[PDB]
Amino acid sequence: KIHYRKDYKPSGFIINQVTLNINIHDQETIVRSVLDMDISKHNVGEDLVFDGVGLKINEISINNKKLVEGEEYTYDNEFLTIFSKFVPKSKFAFSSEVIIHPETNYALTGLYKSKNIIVSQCEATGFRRITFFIDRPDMMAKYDVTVTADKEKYPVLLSNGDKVNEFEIPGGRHGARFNDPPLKPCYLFAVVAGDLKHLSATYITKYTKKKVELYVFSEEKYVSKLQWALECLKKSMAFDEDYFGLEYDLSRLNLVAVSDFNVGAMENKGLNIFNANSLLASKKNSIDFSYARILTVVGHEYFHQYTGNRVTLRDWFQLTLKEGLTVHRENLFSEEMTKTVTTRLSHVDLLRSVQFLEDSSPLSHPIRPESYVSMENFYTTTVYDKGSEVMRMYLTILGEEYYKKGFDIYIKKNDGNTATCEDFNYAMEQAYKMKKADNSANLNQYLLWFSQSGTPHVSFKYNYDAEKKQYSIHVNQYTKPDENQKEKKPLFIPISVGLINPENGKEMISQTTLELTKESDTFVFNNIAVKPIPSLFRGFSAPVYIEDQLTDEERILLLKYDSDAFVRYNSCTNIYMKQILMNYNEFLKAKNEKLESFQLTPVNAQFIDAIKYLLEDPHADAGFKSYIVSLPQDRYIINFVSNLDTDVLADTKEYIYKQIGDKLNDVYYKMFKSLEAKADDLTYFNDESHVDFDQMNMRTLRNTLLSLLSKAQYPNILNEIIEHSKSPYPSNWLTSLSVSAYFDKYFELYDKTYKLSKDDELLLQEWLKTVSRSDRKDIYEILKKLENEVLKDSKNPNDIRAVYLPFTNNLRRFHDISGKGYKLIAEVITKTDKFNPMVATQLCEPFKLWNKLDTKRQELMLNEMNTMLQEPQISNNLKEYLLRLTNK
Ligand SMILES: O=C(CNc1ccc(F)cc1)N[C@@H](C(=O)NO)c1ccc(Br)cc1
Ligand SMILES: [Zn+2]
């Protein structure tokens, strides 16, 4: 069954009240549910059809009269159909009692057991796995929820709303009743039961001075890892108050970590539930990346309280309205908290590698898709991250003052209601009219960002008249036709620009955002005293392919002297890309023609000089420095090469890295040594509330330089690697494992770091990732060793993803020409699909570029995908995903 956006129609039914009794027992959970329902104005006498997946019916009733299977209803394990003639014409009560089995629910959707915690996940379609419902987000209802369980095993009981009763039950059990009067969609329902330990705090809101109790929960073993999450929650609350003027509306907010989770976290109202790897950290037992991850995921789920929970979705095709907008709010928050330029750069780096790949793949879709089979397949980097860039462009176009005015219009007008992408565009249009001082101004063209798939390409030509002091930027935009639009239309593209004087590095014009609304336009600037170098798409102001048409000399000047971090990073990126494409084609030709000798174009010496200049600048940023010594990501590069031969690309990267290191290794080594004191400072190692993002960026730089020096076999660098392995910081000692891959000490450090990791669940997963992405010639034997000794039969998604996904980024080995790496991941996908279709589809990620590779590897990947598709037991999720990916 294919659902189409244009087919939306309101239900013929209304569910006003849900009264749940969830009785948890060792071998089963009994769910009783009374739904106080009505007939809506759209009803036309149809059957009453409920969603209900995998439920064991004990009984169902209408108005306390038990219904008879076969004559009055059918149930096919997916839909409960009550025939029209037995459906009442006015207000009525539907009731049911079903049995479900959280303990064997390894798909982690619906109600399931994670270690010793019972927990739910209802977005998008999981509530129907708990009880019968019209399981779609426009069915808003009140919830009164009672949970009972063995008290010894499950002392802590949580659901949405206020706890209004706690009571004892004979036989060692107990119950708690939660009443949540405000309307909500069923995907925001949640329940948690377990032997949970907590940290707590009281937050007083900014304007109404309301006292909000904050609780963060985990299993007892890891309760000492909760402190940063609680601090991040306070920060998120303050940011929504300070930037958006928005306070929390409930008396309490609970965050709960669980070990088994399909994604990062979930915004259930007042009861946010997290993958443990996105809530728990300590400085002894977590890598640095955990701190930014917890900050952004806590922030993300908090910002949903307005953008998703208070203003909700009419239908799932509007997903980007809450996810793109919440990622945008998340990104603003992160940028303000970290105060590092690499925060924005890391978002752009993600979009232009992963999301651009998706947008040029057969899976390409607009941020508001037109159809789906499994809605879980459209929680994508397109909907989330391109969605966020589309939400960010409103702020770029409007400026902070009018953006905040438009955002508040959207909140005030839609608070407590469902909404669509048009409602948001409407609110921004009102601010646009105010800003332009023109009630005729509109953003109708802006809506194409929601409906048009594919990445626009923006290219430039320039003219400077020295006598007239007149400078022109000619701009073109183009989107390649794809399967979603045969004809692509020009978008509203905001181009943040500066003009740099190449003689002194100074700004030449005030802040300027060009509004490109046609296929092409010419923007002219008068009184430009000298020929400038244009600084284009500052802040990465639109999600596009930038073709700057600048010389490498011009790009070097921007890299050294521009004020905008993104344009400097992009100029570096563009210099690298020109070099990569040139050397790639030289290696390819020598391979194709079987040349006994040939030449390679060297790396630009003035570019290497500029890198050295930046690295040696003690006032320059360490995080930015780590980006400039790193080549662009493989998944960024592959968007620019047809029939990419992964071995030739590996040879290209190796040549270019060797070229630069042959000049700069002594600089790299000197910096690695001089950065030690500040990077590894232990002053606050035992203060979990003290997080220094610049210090972590200095560690990133040290660990990047160490990797470069180790690959280069720099003299006696093994000494530094061994010393690095004794650092108290996991980012450092796990780096010592991966860079030791090039030395005879690798398995010594393998065993040392395993011993350091094995007694913390999350640290062990970081160790698994480090092994998985180790640059080892024997990586296939090493993966078998992880399988046999550590991973075993685990159904934990964090374990499976840790063992296999980093390995898939091994350009030389995963893409082994035998196809053995494709075969290995396909076996893992098919095995995983038997119990967790969502994670099976996540493990398909390496196949997304299949039609971008050389002909032999295309065929090898296609064969494994077609083998996967022929599996008799394949899930709907995996089948739909592979059918779309293979154009079948
Ligand atoms: O957690 C994420 C993204 N991060 C992530 C991390 C590791 C992974 F393996 C996968 C995803 N998204 C949340 C979300 O949006 N919460 O607000 C979400 C919620 C429900 C559904 Br259905 C899908 C996605
Ligand atoms: Zn979200």
Give dist(CA 773, CA 805) in Å, integer. Answer: 8
Alpha helices, DSSP H only, in 758-796? Answer: 761-772, 779-786
Query: Given phi > 0 = left and psi -120 to 50 = alpha, else beta, which region is 115?
Result: left
Handedness of CA 306, 307, 309, 311 (dihedral sign): positive
**Was 123 annotated as part of a binding site?**
yes
In the sheet that 271-275 helps form, which strands lie side by side, from edge to edge? 196-204, 211-219, 252-258, 271-275, 265-266
For residue 642, count CB atoms less than 10 angstroms from its CB and return exposed for 0-12, middle for 13-18, buried for 19 or more: exposed
Give dist(CA 344, CA 570) in Å, integer. Answer: 12
Give dist(CA 617, CA 434) in Å, integer. Answer: 45
3-state secondary structure of 295: helix
- Of 289, 334, 297, residue with least CA distance to 806: 289
Protein residue closest via CA to atom 20 of ligand 1: 123
Q: What is the DSSP letter of 645?
A: -
**For a pocket test of ligand 1, which of 122, 379, 838 has the largest count of ligand atoms closer than 8 A to its C-beta?**
379
Give dist(CA 660, CA 486) in Å, integer. Answer: 44
β-strands 252-258, 211-219: how paired? parallel
Handedness of CA 653, 659, 662, 665 (dihedral sign): negative
- Of 422, 427, 426, 393, residue with least CA distance to 408: 427
Crossing angle of the two packed helices 730-739 and 746-757, in degrees rounded to 10? 150
The technique by which this structure was obtained is X-ray
Cβ pair 827, 865 in contact under 8 A: no
Residue 263 Cβ contacting ligand 1 at under 6 Å: yes
3-state secondary structure of 655: helix
Crossing angle of the two packed helices 289-303 and 693-711, in degrees rounded to 10? 130
Task: Look up residue 277 and give its two tokens.
Answer: 């790897």
Handedness of CA 558, 561, 562, 565 (dihedral sign): positive
Per-state percent for the chain, helix, strand, coil, to nearest 5: 45, 20, 35
377 Cα–ligand 1 center, Å = 11
**441 φ, ψ (degrees, to nearest 5):** -70, 145
Atom in ligand 1 nearest the alpha carbon of residue 278: 6
Residue 266 Cβ contacting ligand 1 at under 6 Å: yes
Residue 379 Cβ contacting ligand 1 at under 6 Å: yes
Residue 304 Cβ contacting ligand 1 at under 6 Å: yes
Residue 842 Cβ contacting ligand 1 at under 6 Å: yes
271 Cα–ligand 2 center, Å = 14
Cβ pair 270, 670 in contact under 8 A: no
67 Cα–ligand 2 center, Å = 39
Cβ pair 347, 385 in contact under 8 A: yes
Q: Which residues are catalytic?
A: 301
**Was 213 annotated as part of a binding site?**
no
Residue 34 vs residues 129, 160, 692, 849: alpha-carbon distances, Å: 16, 17, 51, 48
Cβ pair 511, 518 in contact under 8 A: no
For residue 739, what are the contacts with CB-CB under 8 A and spacing of at least 6? 706, 707, 710, 711, 721, 724
Neighbours of 179 (CB within 10 A): 17
Atom in ligand 1 nearest the alpha carbon of residue 384: 15
Handedness of CA 447, 452, 453, 454 (dihedral sign): negative
Residue 766 Cβ contacting ligand 1 at under 6 Å: no
β-strands 252-258, 29-39: how paired? unpaired
**462 φ, ψ (degrees, to nearest 5):** -130, 155
Rg of the chain taking only CA atoms, in angstroms = 28
In the sheet that 470-478 helps form, which strands lie side by side, from edge to edge? 520-525, 470-478, 457-465, 545-547
306 Cα–ligand 1 center, Å = 18
Give dist(CA 191, CA 698) in Å, integer. Answer: 42
Torsion of CA 383, 386, 388, 390, to 10 degrees: -110
Task: Look up residue 406 and give its two tokens.
Answer: 């438009």
**Was 264 annotated as part of a binding site?**
yes
Resolution of the experimental structure, in angstroms: 1.8
Residue 124 Cβ contacting ligand 1 at under 6 Å: yes
Neighbours of 9 (CB within 10 A): 7
**Was 596 annotated as part of a binding site?**
no
Atom in ligand 1 nearest the alpha carbon of residue 262: 9
285 Cα–ligand 2 center, Å = 27
Rounded to a whole number, what is the distance in angstroms from the first to the last CA of the chain? 16
User: What's the angle, vertex CA 436, arms to CA 433 and CA 438, rounded to 5?
Assistant: 60
**Was 265 annotated as part of a binding site?**
yes
Atom in ligand 1 nearest the alpha carbon of residue 124: 22
- Of 579, 558, 557, 554, residue with least CA distance to 568: 558
Task: Look up residue 460 and give its two tokens.
Answer: 């430039």
Crossing angle of the two packed helices 387-414 and 421-436, in degrees rounded to 10? 90
Helix (H) or strand (E) holding 814: helix 811-814
Q: What is the DSSP string of 99-164?
A: EE-GGG-TT-SEEEEETTEEEEE-TTTTGGGTS-B--STT--EEEEEEEEEETTT--EEEESSEEE
Residue 833 Cβ contacting ligand 1 at under 6 Å: no
Atom in ligand 1 nearest the alpha carbon of residue 308: 17
3-state secondary structure of 395: helix
3-state secondary structure of 181: strand
Query: Given phi > 0 = left and psi -120 to 50 = alpha, else beta, which region is 692?
Result: beta
Name the E strands within 704-763.
none
- Of the bound ligands, which one is closest to the alpha carbon of residue 377? 1
Please give the single-letter amino acid code of residue 94.
F
261 Cα–ligand 1 center, Å = 9
